[PDB]
Design goal:
Chain A: Pathway: Protein modification; protein ubiquitination. This is part of a larger assembly, with chains A (513 residues) and B (89 residues). With 513 residues, chain A is mostly helical. Helix content of chain A is 55%, strand content 3%. Chain B is elongated, with a radius of gyration of 18 Å. The chains are: A mainly alpha (513), B alpha+beta (89). The structure holds zinc ion (3 copies). One zinc ion binds next to strand 4 of chain B.
Chain lengths: 513, 89
C-alpha cells in the first residue's frame, strides 16, 4: 500500500503544480520527493520485511515488482538498492539449492529446480524490469558467484540430456522436444568446466551407441548441430569419429555376415553382430579382460580377429568382455534370455557341468576381480521374481561354497526376456569418480601444454607473467585457469626441445620450430 | 543342451602399427621413456612423458611425435595429417 499511496501523492502533487502553481517549480521538489522522501525511507524499504521485496519474490506478485520498478526509476541509486537485495535473496536460494550437505541430490531434479528458479527470475525480470541491463548484469554475476561450487553439475546435466535423448516417451512430438533442448543448451551456456561435460557426454554416447540401437535415429543430427553452436568444433573430431566408427562397425558387421554365409563352417559363426571401432575414439574399459569365453563366442572372436588381421594388413584385434550383449536361447516354451557379455562364461560353464560355486568359476576361468564380483552379484543378488540363477545359501553377502541353480520363472510373458541389472540408478561411486577426475586432470594438463606450443610459436615472449594471461584467456571458456598447475607445468618445457623457456635468462626466449 | 547361444554382438577394437613394443619414431618401447629422456627420474616429476594416440590409431611417446611435429607434420607410418584423441596408454 505504500507504493500505491506514494504514487497517488506523486500524481496529486503533479496535478497541483500543473494548476495552482507552475510546473517549472516541480523539478527541484521531485528531487527531494525522490530523495528526502523516497531515498529517505527507500533504505528501510529496499530491505526490512512486512510483505517486502524478499517476500514478493517468493510469493510472485509481479504487479508489485513492476510498480516499484516504475517508481524507483526516478530516485537515484534506487536500482542499486533493489539489485543488492534481490541478489542477496538469489544467493540465499542458490546456496540453499547447491547445498552439498546430505549427498543424494537427485540429478535430473536438482538442475530442473535450477532451471525453474532461473526461469522465474528471468520472467520476473522481463515483465517488471523490461530487460534492464543493470538487473541482467547483477543476476549474471550472482549466477557466476555460486556456480564455482557443485562440480557434479556438468555430470548431472549430461545424465539429464542422456535420459532425454535415450527415448522421447515424454513429449512424443518434436516441438516440446525442441523447446526442452533449447532450454537445456541455454542452461549449459551459463556453465563452466566444459571438459568434464564433454567427457561425460562422450561416455553417454558410448553407452547409448554400444547398446540396443534405434533410440531416436534423427535427434543425433540436432544434438551435433546444437553442440557446434555450444561447445564448438574442437570436440567434433572425436564426436564425428564416434559416428564414423559406428558406421564402419555396421558396415563391417554386414560384410562379416556375408563372409560367414560364404565360409562359416563352424557353428560358432551363427547370428553374429561384430562392431569395429578404434582405440583413440572409444577409451579402453579395463586391461582387455582375457577370461574363459564360451566355445561359440570363442569361434566368433577368432574369425573376427583373423579377418581384422588379414584384410586389414597392419591392423589386428584385442579380445575383451566389458562390452556388448547376447541373446541366450533357453528352453514349457523356449524363452530367449539376454546376457551382456558378462554371464556368458558362467552360464557356459554351467551348461558344461552344473552344481558349481565361486571356487569353480574363479579357478578354471581366469576371471578378473571387481567386474567378476559385479556380474555374480547382478545375477544371484538383488533379483526380482525373475531369477534365472538361484542358490541355496540365501544371503546378501557373497560366500565361497554356494551352489548355483536355475528356476523357471514363467512370469516372462514373452520369448525375449532380458536381465537389465546394469545401468541402474546413477550412483557415481568414489573409485569411478576419482579415476575420471584423474583422467580429466591429465586431459586438462595435456590441453594446456598443447595450446601453449600451438600459440607461443607465433607470438612474443614473456618476462614473468605476460603470456600466462593470454593462455588463460584462450582457456577462459574451457575451465578454470588453475594458476598453480599451469605455473608448475610451464617449468616442464625446459626438458622439452621446443622452447626450453630458460628461467634464469628469461630476458630472451627461443623459437626453435 | 539347456542353454544355447543364438545371437552375439561383440565389438572388436583394432590397433594399427602402434607397435606395443617399439615406438616408431625413437625406437625404445611403447612405454619405458624416450630418447630425449631415458632416465625414469631426473627432474621429471611423475615422469612427464606419456604415450600419444593418433586418430590413425598409431602410437608414439608424446615427446617424440610432438618434437617430430616441429618439422614433418603428417604421421610417418601412413600419410594422414594425424590428429589427437587419447593420451597415455
Ligand atoms: Zn619414442
Ligand atoms: Zn620423453
Ligand atoms: Zn598413422
Amino acid at each position: 500500500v505504500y507504493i500505491k499511496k506514494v504514487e497517488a501523492r506523486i500524481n496529486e502533487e503533479i496535478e497541483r503544480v500543473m494548476h495552482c502553481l507552475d510546473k517549472s517549480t516541480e523539478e527541484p521538489i521531485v528531487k527531494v520527493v525522490e530523495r528526502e522522501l523516497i531515498s529517505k525511507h527507500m533504505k528501510t524499504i529496499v530491505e526490512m520485511e512486512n510483505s517486502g521485496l524478499v517476500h514478493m519474490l517468493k510469493n510472485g506478485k509481479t504487479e508489485d515488482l513492476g510498480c516499484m520498478y516504475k517508481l524507483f526509476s526516478r530516485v537515484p541509486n534506487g536500482l542499486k538498492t533493489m539489485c543488492e537485495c534481490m541478489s542477496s535473496y538469489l544467493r540465499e536460494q542458490g546456496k540453499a539449492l547447491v547445498s552439498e550437505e546430505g549427498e543424494g541430490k537427485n540429478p535430473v531434479d536438482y538442475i530442473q529446480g535450477l532451471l525453474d528458479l532461473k526461469s522465474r527470475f528471468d520472467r520476473f525480470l522481463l515483465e517488471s524490469f523490461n530487460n534492464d541491463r543493470l538487473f541482467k548484469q547483477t543476476i549474471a554475476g550472482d549466477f557466476e558467484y555460486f556456480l564455482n561450487l557443485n562440480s557434479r553439475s556438468p555430470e548431472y546435466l549430461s545424465l539429464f540430456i542422456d535420459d532425454k535423448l535415450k527415448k522421447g516417451v515424454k513429449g512424443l512430438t518434436e516441438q516440446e522436444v525442441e523447446t526442452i533442448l533449447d532450454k537445456a543448451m541455454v542452461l549449459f551456456r551459463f556453465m563452466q568446466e566444459k571438459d568434464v561435460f564433454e567427457r561425460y557426454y562422450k561416455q553417454h554416447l558410448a553407452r547409448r551407441l554400444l547398446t540396443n540401437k534405434s533410440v531416436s535415429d534423427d535427434s543425433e543430427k540436432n544434438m551435433i548441430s546444437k553442440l557446434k553452436t555450444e561447445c564448438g568444433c574442437q570436440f567434433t573430431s572425436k564426436l564425428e569419429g564416434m559416428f564414423r566408427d559406428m558406421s564402419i562397425s555396421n558396415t563391417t558387421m554386414d560384410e562379416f555376415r556375408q563372409h560367414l554365409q560364404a565360409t562359416g563352417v563352424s557353428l560358432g559363426g551363427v547370428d553374429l553382430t561384430v562392431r569395429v571401432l578404434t582405440t583413440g575414439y572409444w577409451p579402453t574399459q579395463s586391461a582387455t579382460p582375457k577370461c574363459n569365453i564360451p566355445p561359440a563366442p570363442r569361434h566368433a572372436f577368432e574369425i573376427f580377429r583373423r579377418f581384422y588381421l588379414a584384410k586389414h594388413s597392419g591392423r589386428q584385434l584385442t579380445l575383451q568382455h566389458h562390452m556388448g550383449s547376447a541373446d541366450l536361447n533357453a528352453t514349457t516354451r523356449k524363452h530367449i534370455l539376454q546376457v551382456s557379455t558378462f554371464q556368458m562364461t558362467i552360464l557356459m560353464l554351467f551348461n558344461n557341468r552344473e552344481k558349481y560355486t565361486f571356487e569353480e568359476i574363479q579357478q578354471e576361468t581366469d576371471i578378473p576381480e571387481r567386474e567378476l564380483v559385479r556380474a555374480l552379484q547382478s545375477l544371484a543378488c538383488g533379483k526380482p521374481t525373475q531369477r534365472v540363477l538361484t542358490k541355496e545359501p540365501k544371503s546378501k553377502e557373497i560366500e565361497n561354497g554356494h551352489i548355483f541353480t536355475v528356476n523357471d520363472q514363467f512370469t516372462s510373458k514373452l520369448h525375449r526376456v532380458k536381465i537389465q541389472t546394469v545401468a541402474a540408478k546413477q550412483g557415481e561411486s568414489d573409485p569411478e569418480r576419482k579415476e575420471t577426475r584423474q583422467k580429466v586432470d591429465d586431459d586438462r594438463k595435456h590441453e594446456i601444454e598443447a595450446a601453449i606450443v600451438r600459440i607461443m610459436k607465433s607470438r612474443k615472449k614473456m618476462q614473468h607473467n605476460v603470456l600466462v594471461a593470454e593462455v588463460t584467456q584462450q582457456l577462459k571458456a574451457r575451465f578454470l585457469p588453475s594458476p598453480v598447475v599451469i605455473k608448475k607445468r610451464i617449468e616442464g618445457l625446459i626438458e622439452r626441445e621446443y622452447l626450453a623457456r630458460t628461467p634464469e635468462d628469461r630476458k630472451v626466449y627461443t623459437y626453435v620450430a | 543342451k539347456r542353454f544355447e547361444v543364438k545371437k552375439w554382438n561383440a565389438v572388436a577394437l583394432w590397433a594399427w602399427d602402434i607397435v606395443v613394443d617399439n615406438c616408431a619414431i625413437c625406437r625404445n618401447h611403447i612405454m619405458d621413456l624416450c630418447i630425449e629422456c631415458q632416465a625414469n627420474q631426473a627432474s621429471a616429476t611423475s615422469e612427464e612423458c606419456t604415450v600419444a594416440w593418433g586418430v590413425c590409431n598409431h602410437a608414439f611417446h608424446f615427446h617424440c611425435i610432438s618434437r617430430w611435429l616441429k618439422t614433418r607434420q603428417v604421421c610417418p607410418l601412413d600419410n594422414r595429417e594425424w590428429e589427437f584423441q587419447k593420451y597415455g596408454h
